[PDB]
Design a protein around this ligand. Sequence first.
Ligand SMILES: [Zn+2]
Ligand SMILES: [Zn+2]
Lengths: 48, 48
Amino acid sequence: DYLRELLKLELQLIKQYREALEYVKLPVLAKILEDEEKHIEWLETILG
Amino acid sequence: DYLRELLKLELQLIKQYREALEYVKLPVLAKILEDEEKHIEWLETILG
Ligand SMILES: [Zn+2]
Ligand SMILES: [Zn+2]
């Protein structure tokens, strides 16, 4: 439930990052996207 | 300012993750900590 909360804020982050990359165009942001996505991949596994 | 908002939620996430690792003890969470920390390192550089 602590993992679910954690999972919500990585979903919120993924979204904002997604919109910044169409905005500004910065490779690094695209690096953090990748990272955020693997985190929800892993939290989602912990959760079933 | 979009980077600052992004930076706030990675600060919030870092904190919660930090408290989960003293709670549950899971290597993976310690992996996501590392990742979240490098992200604020990089956003902080973009910001000066
Ligand atoms: Zn993350
Ligand atoms: Zn992050």
